[PDB]
Protein backbone atom coordinates (compact mmCIF):
# COMPACT_ATOMS: atom_id res chain seq x y z
CA UNK A 1 0.00 0.00 0.00
CA UNK A 2 1.37 3.36 -1.11
CA UNK A 3 -0.70 6.19 -2.58
CA UNK A 4 0.71 9.57 -3.74
CA UNK A 5 -0.28 12.36 -1.35
CA UNK A 6 1.70 15.16 -2.99
CA UNK A 7 2.72 15.47 -6.64
CA UNK A 8 2.52 18.43 -9.02
CA UNK A 9 4.54 17.80 -12.23
CA UNK A 10 3.27 21.17 -13.46
CA UNK A 11 4.42 22.96 -10.32
CA UNK A 12 8.04 23.63 -11.26
CA UNK A 13 7.60 25.92 -14.27
CA UNK A 14 10.79 27.19 -15.90
CA UNK A 15 11.60 28.82 -19.24
CA UNK A 16 15.17 27.52 -19.04
CA UNK A 17 14.30 24.32 -20.84
CA UNK A 18 13.37 26.45 -23.84
CA UNK A 19 16.69 28.26 -24.13
CA UNK A 20 18.41 25.13 -22.85
CA UNK A 21 16.61 22.91 -25.36
CA UNK A 22 17.80 25.22 -28.15
CA UNK A 23 21.40 24.52 -27.27
CA UNK A 24 20.01 21.00 -26.90
CA UNK A 25 18.66 20.58 -30.43
CA UNK A 26 20.80 18.38 -32.67
CA UNK A 27 24.25 19.31 -31.37
CA UNK A 28 25.99 16.56 -33.33
CA UNK A 29 27.10 16.61 -36.96
CA UNK A 30 27.85 12.90 -37.11
CA UNK A 31 24.65 12.15 -39.03
CA UNK A 32 24.18 10.84 -42.57
CA UNK A 33 26.49 8.27 -44.16
CA UNK A 34 24.81 4.97 -43.33
CA UNK A 35 22.66 4.75 -40.23
Amino acid sequence: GFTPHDSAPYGALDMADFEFEQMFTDALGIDEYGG
Binding site: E21, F24, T25, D26, A27, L28, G35
Partner: protein, 115 residues
Protein backbone atom coordinates in the same frame (compact mmCIF):
# COMPACT_ATOMS: atom_id res chain seq x y z
CA UNK B 1 33.70 3.72 -15.96
CA UNK B 2 32.56 3.32 -19.57
CA UNK B 3 28.99 2.98 -18.29
CA UNK B 4 29.30 5.11 -15.18
CA UNK B 5 29.94 8.77 -14.52
CA UNK B 6 29.06 11.86 -12.53
CA UNK B 7 26.38 14.21 -13.83
CA UNK B 8 24.04 16.84 -12.41
CA UNK B 9 20.37 15.86 -12.60
CA UNK B 10 17.38 18.10 -11.93
CA UNK B 11 19.95 20.80 -11.21
CA UNK B 12 21.23 18.85 -8.22
CA UNK B 13 24.82 17.54 -8.08
CA UNK B 14 24.79 13.77 -8.44
CA UNK B 15 26.14 10.68 -10.18
CA UNK B 16 24.97 8.43 -13.03
CA UNK B 17 25.10 4.66 -13.49
CA UNK B 18 24.26 2.80 -16.70
CA UNK B 19 22.66 -0.64 -16.55
CA UNK B 20 23.66 -2.03 -19.95
CA UNK B 21 23.85 -5.49 -18.37
CA UNK B 22 20.07 -5.58 -18.13
CA UNK B 23 17.98 -6.53 -21.18
CA UNK B 24 15.99 -3.24 -21.29
CA UNK B 25 19.30 -1.40 -20.73
CA UNK B 26 18.63 1.71 -18.67
CA UNK B 27 20.49 4.63 -17.10
CA UNK B 28 20.14 5.18 -13.34
CA UNK B 29 21.17 8.39 -11.60
CA UNK B 30 21.16 9.40 -7.94
CA UNK B 31 22.09 12.54 -6.02
CA UNK B 32 25.65 12.80 -4.71
CA UNK B 33 24.25 12.05 -1.28
CA UNK B 34 20.76 13.47 -1.06
CA UNK B 35 18.81 10.23 -0.74
CA UNK B 36 17.50 11.10 -4.19
CA UNK B 37 17.17 8.95 -7.30
CA UNK B 38 16.33 9.22 -10.99
CA UNK B 39 16.16 6.34 -13.46
CA UNK B 40 15.21 6.31 -17.14
CA UNK B 41 14.59 3.40 -19.50
CA UNK B 42 14.90 3.46 -23.29
CA UNK B 43 11.50 1.77 -23.39
CA UNK B 44 10.19 5.30 -22.78
CA UNK B 45 13.15 7.17 -24.24
CA UNK B 46 14.41 6.41 -27.76
CA UNK B 47 16.70 9.38 -28.35
CA UNK B 48 19.60 11.19 -26.67
CA UNK B 49 20.96 14.70 -27.34
CA UNK B 50 24.47 15.77 -26.32
CA UNK B 51 26.55 18.92 -26.81
CA UNK B 52 29.42 19.29 -29.34
CA UNK B 53 33.01 18.30 -28.58
CA UNK B 54 34.31 21.83 -29.12
CA UNK B 55 31.92 22.95 -26.39
CA UNK B 56 32.70 22.76 -22.67
CA UNK B 57 29.20 22.37 -21.25
CA UNK B 58 29.34 18.55 -21.19
CA UNK B 59 25.63 17.70 -21.02
CA UNK B 60 22.97 15.63 -22.79
CA UNK B 61 19.19 15.29 -22.71
CA UNK B 62 17.17 12.16 -23.49
CA UNK B 63 13.88 12.16 -25.35
CA UNK B 64 10.86 10.18 -24.21
CA UNK B 65 10.24 8.87 -27.74
CA UNK B 66 7.23 10.08 -29.70
CA UNK B 67 4.56 8.32 -31.75
CA UNK B 68 4.64 10.66 -34.74
CA UNK B 69 3.82 7.53 -36.73
CA UNK B 70 2.90 5.14 -33.93
CA UNK B 71 0.12 7.14 -32.23
CA UNK B 72 -2.92 5.25 -30.96
CA UNK B 73 -6.63 5.82 -31.56
CA UNK B 74 -9.37 6.59 -29.05
CA UNK B 75 -12.60 7.33 -30.93
CA UNK B 76 -12.14 10.60 -32.82
CA UNK B 77 -10.05 8.77 -35.40
CA UNK B 78 -7.24 11.32 -35.24
CA UNK B 79 -5.35 8.76 -33.14
CA UNK B 80 -2.60 10.79 -31.49
CA UNK B 81 -0.02 10.21 -28.77
CA UNK B 82 0.12 12.37 -25.58
CA UNK B 83 2.78 15.05 -25.16
CA UNK B 84 6.26 13.39 -25.06
CA UNK B 85 8.36 13.58 -21.91
CA UNK B 86 12.11 14.16 -22.14
CA UNK B 87 14.79 14.71 -19.48
CA UNK B 88 17.93 16.86 -19.44
CA UNK B 89 21.04 16.69 -17.23
CA UNK B 90 24.61 18.04 -17.23
CA UNK B 91 27.99 16.31 -16.92
CA UNK B 92 31.07 17.17 -14.88
CA UNK B 93 33.76 15.17 -16.70
CA UNK B 94 35.11 14.65 -20.22
CA UNK B 95 35.11 10.85 -20.01
CA UNK B 96 31.83 10.74 -18.08
CA UNK B 97 29.95 12.19 -21.04
CA UNK B 98 31.74 10.20 -23.73
CA UNK B 99 31.73 6.96 -21.75
CA UNK B 100 27.96 7.03 -21.32
CA UNK B 101 27.26 8.93 -24.56
CA UNK B 102 29.05 6.16 -26.40
CA UNK B 103 26.95 3.75 -24.36
CA UNK B 104 23.58 5.38 -24.96
CA UNK B 105 24.54 5.82 -28.59
CA UNK B 106 24.63 2.04 -28.91
CA UNK B 107 21.54 1.28 -26.87
CA UNK B 108 19.62 4.10 -28.53
CA UNK B 109 20.87 2.67 -31.78
CA UNK B 110 19.63 -0.74 -30.64
CA UNK B 111 16.15 0.47 -29.73
CA UNK B 112 16.28 2.79 -32.74
CA UNK B 113 17.23 -0.04 -35.10
CA UNK B 114 14.41 -2.30 -33.91
CA UNK B 115 11.70 0.26 -34.69
Amino acid sequence: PSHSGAAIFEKVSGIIAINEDVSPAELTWRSTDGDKVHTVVLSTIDKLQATPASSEKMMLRLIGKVDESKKRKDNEGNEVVPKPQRHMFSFNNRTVMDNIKMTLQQIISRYKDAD
